[PDB]
């Protein structure tokens, strides 16, 4: 379906062109395969992002990255990429609002869930290749502070920083007042604590 | 060593195969002891 959509949209097939007359165009890749070229990557990239957040392209299974200094766009739909959920910030503000939080509390009798939340397009799954391109903000606090800070260009935001921790590093209290090898040593001993 | 104005007395090397070819087996005994002495002093610990 990704190949279908691109083909109907504007992407020229490799045999439709003479490279020396159109080589300046942005290249398109699908799972490491060179499908064609395109003369307007910003709109198309914006459109693809809009579709994935709209659920017309399978969000968890599709990563989409633009590398502008090489004027190419690769997309991957293969299995085995590690990706994490992140908040989408737009116009230098959160796209998630308090109305959604009250909707989430409502679930004690409501059928509204995390999947509904993703469909609101306020969160996206971002793999390590795509994580190379985002401007990720540590906290909404910093994103507010920006009026004096150096950066005002954020695109994603951390849902919380302790989440960078795996299961055993998560049982342990105040891990940052630990000298770092202590955290590794506990995670081992944690498997050996019987219970 | 053969070049002009280079002191032919104190000029030395951290290499051992070359020290042997030029200076001969006794000089290796001294230089090799010195190089071993040098790694040990760096690491700070003393060896008798």
């Amino acid at each position: 379906p990704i190949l279908e959509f691109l083909e109907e949209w504007s992407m020229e097939n490799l045999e439709e062109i003479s490279p020396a007359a159109i080589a300046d165009a942005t290249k398109i890749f699908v799972n490491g395969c060179w499908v064609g070229i395109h003369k307007d990557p910003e709109q198309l990239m914006n459109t693809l992002r809009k579709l994935r957040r709209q659920m017309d392209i399978i969000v968890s299974e599709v990563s989409m990255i633009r590398d502008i200094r090489e004027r190419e766009i690769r997309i991957y739909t293969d299995a085995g990429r590690i990706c994490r959920p992140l908040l989408i910030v737009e116009k230098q503000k959160l796209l998630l609002k308090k109305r959604h939080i009250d909707q989430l509390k409502e679930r004690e009798y409501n059928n509204y869930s995390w999947q509904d939340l993703v469909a609101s397009g306020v969160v996206e799954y971002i793999d390590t290749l795509e994580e190379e391109t985002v401007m990720l903000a540590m906290t909404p606090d910093d994103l507010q502070e920006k009026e004096v800070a150096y950066c005002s260009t954020y695109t994603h935001c951390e849902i919380h920083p302790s989440m960078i921790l795996g299961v055993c590093a998560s049982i342990i209290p105040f891990p940052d007042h630990n000298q770092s090898p202590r955290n590794t040593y506990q995670s081992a001993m944690g498997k050996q604590a019987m219970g | 060593l053969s070049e002009k104005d280079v002191d032919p007395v104190r000029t030395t090397s951290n290499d051992i195969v070359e020290i042997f070819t030029v200076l001969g087996i006794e000089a290796v005994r001294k230089a090799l002891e010195r190089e071993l002495y040098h790694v040990i002093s760096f690491d700070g610990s003393y060896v008798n």
């Binding site: - | 104005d5 090397s13 790694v39």
Partner: protein, 192 residues
């Protein structure tokens, strides 16, 4: 790693040095010599600079700013109009074999700061390359006070024996191409 002076990526430290030393390695990871200086050279920076220059293994490739190959059979009508003054300068330079020199020209441009640091002269280079390749490699050079430093190179032959006796024992190698091999070797070999 232990930061010290200018040096450092010097002498492997510790267990990797113990293994290197104790194995009697033919190829140490960082071989060095601590050289001491004498006379005025033991107390003067510029004298030390001079001895260092003799010691420093510099090759012509390290020295060259630029190279070019030009098609110019007769100098006295040079394709590079600015070169025209050396032709005035070099008409008496073996004036007979201008009828013999190949129409393929090599031109080298040298940096004045880098040439200064090695304290090297243009005549020593001409003499070094001439001596290495032989009288066949006909070299001429410029005035040291020019704002552009240039070396002008053609290739000559042995005159008498080359009259297409059988088919010229070269197998008709292209002469430009041979000039690249001169440029390949001239840079990579010449230990000025």
């Amino acid at each position: 790693f232990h930061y010290a002076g200018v040096s450092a990526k010097n002498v492997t430290l510790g267990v990797p040095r113990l293994k290197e030393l104790i194995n009697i390695s033919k190829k140490p990871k960082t071989p060095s010599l601590t050289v001491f200086l004498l006379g005025q050279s033991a107390r003067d920076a510029e004298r030390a600079k001079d001895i260092l220059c003799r010691l420093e293994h510099t090759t012509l490739r390290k020295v060259t700013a630029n190279t070019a190959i030009y098609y110019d059979p007769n100098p006295q009508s040079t394709v590079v109009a600015e070169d025209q003054e050396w032709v005035n300068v070099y008409y008496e330079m073996p004036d007979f074999d201008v009828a013999r020199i190949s129409p393929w020209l090599l031109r080298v441009e040298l940096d004045r700061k880098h040439m200064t640091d090695r304290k090297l002269t243009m005549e020593q280079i001409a003499e070094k390359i001439n001596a290495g390749f032989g009288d066949d490699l006909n070299c001429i050079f410029n005035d040291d006070n020019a704002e552009k430093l240039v070396l002008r190179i053609r290739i000559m032959n042995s005159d008498e024996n080359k009259m297409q006796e059988e088919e010229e024992v070269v197998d008709k190698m292209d002469d430009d191409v041979f000039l690249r091999c001169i440029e390949s070797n001239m840079l990579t070999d010449m230990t000025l």
